[PDB]
Amino acid sequence: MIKVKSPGRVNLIGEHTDYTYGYVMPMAINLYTKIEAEKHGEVILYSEHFGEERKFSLNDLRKENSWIDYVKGIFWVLKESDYEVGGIKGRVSGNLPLGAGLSSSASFEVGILETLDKLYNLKLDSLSKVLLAKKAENEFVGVPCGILDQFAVVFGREGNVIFLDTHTLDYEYIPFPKDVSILVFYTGVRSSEYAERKHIAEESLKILGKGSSKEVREGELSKLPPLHRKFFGYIVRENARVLEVRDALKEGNVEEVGKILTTAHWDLAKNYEVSCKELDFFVERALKLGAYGARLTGAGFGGSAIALVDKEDAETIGEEILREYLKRFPWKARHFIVEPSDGVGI
Numbered sequence: 260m261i262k263v264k265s266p267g268r269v270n271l272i273g274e275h276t277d278y279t280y281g282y283v284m285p286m287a288i289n290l291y292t293k294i295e296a297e298k299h300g301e302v303i304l305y306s307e308h309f310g311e312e313r314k315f316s317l318n319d320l321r322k323e324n325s326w327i328d329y330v331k332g333i334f335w336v337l338k339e340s341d342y343e344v345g346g347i348k349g350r351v352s353g354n355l356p357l358g359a360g361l362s363s364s365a366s367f368e369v370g371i372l373e374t375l376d377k378l379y380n381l382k383l384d385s386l387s388k389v390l391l392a393k394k395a396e397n398e399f400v401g402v403p404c405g406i407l408d409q410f411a412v413v414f415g416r417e418g419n420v421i422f423l424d425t426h427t428l429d430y431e432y433i434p435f436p437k438d439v440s441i442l443v444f445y446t447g448v449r450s451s452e453y454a455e456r457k458h459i460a461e462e463s464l465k466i467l468g469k470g471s472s473k474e475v476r477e478g479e480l481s482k483l484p485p486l487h488r489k490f491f492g493y494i495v496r497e498n499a500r501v502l503e504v505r506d507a508l509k510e511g512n513v514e515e516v517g518k519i520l521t522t523a524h525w526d527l528a529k530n531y532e533v534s535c536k537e538l539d540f541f542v543e544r545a546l547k548l549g550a551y552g553a554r555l556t557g558a559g560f561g562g563s564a565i566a567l568v569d570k571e572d573a574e575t576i577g578e579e580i581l582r583e584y585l586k587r588f589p590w591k592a593r594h595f596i597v598e599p600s601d602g603v604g605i
């Protein structure tokens with residue numbers, strides 16, 4: 260029997276940049292999918308979250324349109340890459356909230372991959388784990404996505420964020436300040452919009468004749484159609500913000516990091532049009548209550564937001580905002596205090 264702990268993730272800055280091969284800056288967080296498993300002739304997994312067992316023969320990688328598909332996708336991608344692995348029997352648990360925008364999918368997929376890696380002695384390198392998990396999500400599960408989530412879940416390092424160039428896959432660890440906490444606020448609001456943004460951005464790159472948004476300047480966007488232009492303007496500003504945050508963090512200037520996050524949030528909300536009143540509420544109140552800055556994290560249109568706050572005030576701020584929020588909105592909102600953590604491991 261082995262135990263794997265696979266973290267979720269938050270993106271600090273660099274939102275809606277990965278699918279144009281821009282810059283991103285995620286961290287793994289200390290909320291986890293836990294998998295405890297042993298070898299078996301078929302695949303049998305009990306999900307604590309769903310309170311149910313689902314199983315399949317190794318012969319059977321047919322999509323079933325349930326959570327088991329995330330498991331099948333890893334078996335599929337391993338088979339497609341010429342690995343021989345056998346079955347597993349085990350239990351999936353942990354404290355990472357499902358569908359909150361903290362990357363339940365990548366956490367789970369990478370966790371299954373790591374379980375198989377260890378049980379079957381596959382000796383996968385870290386980048387292969389990221390690429391296999393991404394390929395499973397994209398091609399088997401059928402969810403478009405960039406590399407952000409998988410990279411964070413694998414490459415996370417305690418006390419550090421990851422600055423990543425998603426075009427080259429060059430990355431560096433940047434220390435995150437002591438006694439600054441990440442307050443995560445899940446709105447209680449659990450894809451077509453994402454696919455549209457991705458499609459428009461990819462088309463814009465072709466119009467511009469460029470392979471990455473890193474290569475694009477404000478000036479060039481006049482060449483794009485009005486809607487392409489609006490959205491791509493955000494992407495260019497966002498890449499610049501990632502580099503600004505990198506410099507500010509390397510100086511320990513959390514006040515500047517916070518300011519940049521806030522600017523980024525309103526850019527997402529007003530120009531990329533991917534926020535909602537629930538996320539905006541959290542951001543505005545967190546700022547009034549003393550956060551250095553705040554921003555939605557992940558795709559938007561629900562999910563979670565983050566606020567950078569003094570460690571000693573994180574609990575009070577989360578509690579005050581949650582009470583206000585629940586008077587205004589019907590959803591089962593939750594807050595968590597997280598820190599930058601190590602990537603997937605036993």
Ligand SMILES: OC[C@H]1O[C@H](O)[C@H](O)[C@@H](O)[C@H]1O
Nearest residue numbers: 274275404405406407557558
């Ligand atoms: O930054 C937006 C973010 O949206 C989702 O979380 C995707 O899975 C990521 O790859 C990234 O595109």
